[PDB]
């Protein structure tokens with residue numbers, strides 16, 4: 848019934864949408880932690896100090912780690928920022944991040960208050 852609970856329900860709804868089949872064609876690079884070694888990205892952890900991905904956001908939501916919508920939004924935006932920091936801006940994965948961030952920002956803006 849409380850404001851923070853209602854806002855976190857909205858956040859959980861957004862999280863479910865970002866993980867849904869509707870967005871899977873561009874969301875899939877953000878499903879799991881970047882496996883830098885497996886992808887040959889041996890500079891990844893020198894450039895990205897705070898990795899973030901949607902499985903980590905889901906674990907934190909399930910564990911009641913997020914106390915408010917702003918904390919949730921900070922992790923989702925960190926995930927996008929990491930992609931924009933690491934990758935040249937004309938790379939495919941950046942286009943995919945920008946499309947998923949459009950989904951995120953437009954729905955986040957509909958936060959109940």
Ligand SMILES: Cc1nnc(-c2ccccc2OCc2ccccc2)[nH]1
Nearest residue numbers: 876877881886888930933934939940
């Ligand atoms: C998240 C994330 N941020 N950067 C990457 C990434 C960077 C370089 C190479 C692969 C990469 O992720 C796998 C991938 C994505 C798109 C298309 C093909 C592979 N992934």
